[PDB]
Design a protein around this motif. Structure first.
Motif, PDB file in Angstrom:
ATOM      1  N   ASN A  93       0.819  -1.202   0.000  1.00 44.36           N
ATOM      2  CA  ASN A  93       0.000   0.000   0.000  1.00 44.36           C
ATOM      3  C   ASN A  93       0.858   1.258   0.000  1.00 44.36           C
ATOM      4  N   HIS A  94       2.016   1.227   0.671  1.00 44.63           N
ATOM      5  CA  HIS A  94       2.921   2.373   0.633  1.00 44.63           C
ATOM      6  C   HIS A  94       3.432   2.636  -0.778  1.00 44.63           C
ATOM      7  N   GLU A  97       0.752   4.351  -2.672  1.00 48.63           N
ATOM      8  CA  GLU A  97       0.636   5.732  -2.212  1.00 48.63           C
ATOM      9  C   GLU A  97       1.763   6.592  -2.765  1.00 48.63           C
ATOM     10  N   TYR A  98       2.996   6.084  -2.720  1.00 49.28           N
ATOM     11  CA  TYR A  98       4.131   6.848  -3.219  1.00 49.28           C
ATOM     12  C   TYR A  98       4.010   7.092  -4.720  1.00 49.28           C
ATOM     13  N   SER A 100       1.403   7.329  -6.407  1.00 54.25           N
ATOM     14  CA  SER A 100       0.230   8.158  -6.643  1.00 54.25           C
ATOM     15  C   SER A 100       0.448   9.592  -6.182  1.00 54.25           C
ATOM     16  N   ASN A 101       1.675   9.949  -5.801  1.00 50.91           N
ATOM     17  CA  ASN A 101       2.009  11.294  -5.308  1.00 50.91           C
ATOM     18  C   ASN A 101       1.246  11.642  -4.032  1.00 50.91           C
ATOM     19  N   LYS A 102       1.045  10.650  -3.170  1.00 48.73           N
ATOM     20  CA  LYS A 102       0.310  10.896  -1.940  1.00 48.73           C
ATOM     21  C   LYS A 102       1.172  10.924  -0.693  1.00 48.73           C
ATOM     22  N   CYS A 103       2.406  10.430  -0.753  1.00 44.16           N
ATOM     23  CA  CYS A 103       3.265  10.410   0.421  1.00 44.16           C
ATOM     24  C   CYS A 103       4.721  10.351  -0.013  1.00 44.16           C
ATOM     25  N   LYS A 104       5.600  10.689   0.920  1.00 39.31           N
ATOM     26  CA  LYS A 104       7.022  10.647   0.637  1.00 39.31           C
ATOM     27  C   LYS A 104       7.502   9.197   0.631  1.00 39.31           C
TER      28      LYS A 104
END
Length: 275
Positions: A93-94, A97-98, A100-104
């Motif tokens: 999931n990380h 997210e990464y 998808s430009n949602k988290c570092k």
């Protein structure tokens, strides 16, 4: 098994290029980047890159090897029977997210992808965005369903393996020197199938006898169709023969480069001590 593999490889081995692609420079650079984040990319894997993209420029080969390293690191973790299941779900999931430009980037695998040396001058290429789009699908439609599933029909395996294999994430690398995307369709599908049949054939001994893993086309085909290994090898040989001809008969740039990838993947598996 051994005689079935011998007969299969003799039928299809038609790799016309050098058995010694120039790989040392890009092997070293990929391993240096891996080590920067505490990761390991075995040197023999760089030979596969050299065999499958022989028409690429040196910088495109470098980035292709870096992408193959990303796939290796992720497969290493997700296929690891001793990695806790919650940790697998967290990393998968990380990565989504990464990407998808949602988290570092906060795990070694995504820090590797985030490094300036990952994509070099191709960071804004169509290839980079397509590789990442396809990697999200590989996780959502391949890896996540697989780590929750126990029973497979042949058809269910074919669908999950299409994504889980990551083959759809490598086709864009073939066009790094052109700045365009591959033509997705029957030829990328046939390439995915041919790569997976070859890979499953070479990994059959390790999967069945050593690792006790059922996740392999030949295992599920034998279960579903109540037949012996030699029969399935014959059936797959016929399938691969027909599909590989269809790939070779198309005057189409995607089909031509998928052909190189299938040929190089076969020579690499033949040469590998891993199988």
């Amino acid at each position: 098994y051994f005689q079935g593999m011998e007969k299969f490889y003799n039928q299809f081995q038609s790799y016309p290029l050098s058995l010694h692609p120039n790989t040392s420079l890009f092997n070293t650079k990929t391993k240096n980047l891996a080590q920067k984040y505490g990761l390991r990319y075995p040197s023999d894997l760089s030979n596969l890159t050299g065999y499958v993209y022989p028409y690429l420029s040196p910088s495109a080969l470098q980035v292709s090897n870096n992408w193959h390293a990303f796939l290796w690191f992720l497969d290493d973790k997700i296929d690891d029977p001793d990695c806790p299941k919650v940790e697998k779900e967290i990393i998968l999931n990380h990565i989504i997210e990464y990407l998808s430009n949602k988290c570092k980037a906060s795990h070694p695998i995504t820090q590797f992808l985030d490094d300036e040396e990952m994509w070099l001058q191709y960071k804004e290429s169509k290839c980079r965005f397509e590789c990442e789009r396809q990697a999200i699908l590989m996780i959502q439609k391949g890896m996540i369903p697989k780590w929750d599933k126990e029973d497979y029909t042949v058809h269910e395996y074919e669908k999950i393996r299409f994504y889980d294999s990551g083959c759809e994430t490598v086709w864009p690398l073939m066009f790094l020197d052109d700045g365009i995307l591959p033509q997705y369709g029957v030829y990328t599908k046939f390439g995915n199938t041919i790569v997976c049949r070859v890979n499953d054939l070479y990994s059959y001994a390790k999967d069945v006898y050593r690792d006790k893993s059922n996740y392999n086309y030949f295992v599920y085909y034998m279960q579903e169709n109540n037949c012996h290994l030699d029969e399935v090898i014959n059936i797959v040989t016929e399938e691969v023969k027909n599909k590989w001809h269809m790939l070779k008969n198309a005057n189409n740039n995607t089909a031509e480069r998928v052909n190189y990838w299938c040929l190089g993947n076969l020579v690499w598996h033949h040469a590998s001590e891993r199988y």
